[PDB]
Design a binder for these strands. Structure first.
Length: 53
DNA sequence: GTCGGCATAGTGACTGCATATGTTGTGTTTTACAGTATTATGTAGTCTGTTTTTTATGCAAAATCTAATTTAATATATTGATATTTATATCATTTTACG
C-alpha cells in the first residue's frame, strides 16, 4: 500500500540523493508525511515534495 | 472624455547576503540470507477385515408358437344372354413429390 524511499524517489522527476530525500523527511518537507517501518521510510503514493520558502 | 506629458504599475533583470542543498567522513543500530538440526507432516508401501460390485445360476411366472384338426371359404364345371373391359397415344386433369 505504501512505497519505499527509493521506490518513491525513483518515480520523481529529479531523483536526488538518498541523504537529501531523508532530510526532507526530518524537515517535514513532505506531506502527507512518511512513517518509519523498521529501518526504512514508506511514503504515500500521492506524497509530493512540498517546497515552501 | 480624448489626446499629450511625467507619474503609475506590475513584471523582469541585476547583485550579494543568507540558508537550504550537495559532498565527504565517522560511527551506531538493525535488517536479511546462508547452513545444520529437530519433528510433526502428507504421501508412500502393504496388510487386513468390512463394505461394495461383478458374477454364475436358479425358478416361478407368462404366453406366444407349432402342430393336430375341423370347416367356412375357395375352385372346378355346366350354359348362354347381357354388360364391361379392351389394343394405341396424343390432349386434359388429378395427385404425388420435393423445396
Amino acid at each position: 500500500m505504501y512505497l519505499t524511499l527509493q521506490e518513491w524517489n525513483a518515480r520523481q522527476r529529479r531523483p536526488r540523493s538518498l541523504e537529501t530525500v531523508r532530510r526532507w523527511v526530518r524537515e517535514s518537507r513532505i506531506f502527507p508525511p512518511p512513517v518509519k517501518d523498521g529501518r526504512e521510510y514508506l511514503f504515500h503514493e500521492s506524497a509530493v515534495k512540498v517546497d515552501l520558502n
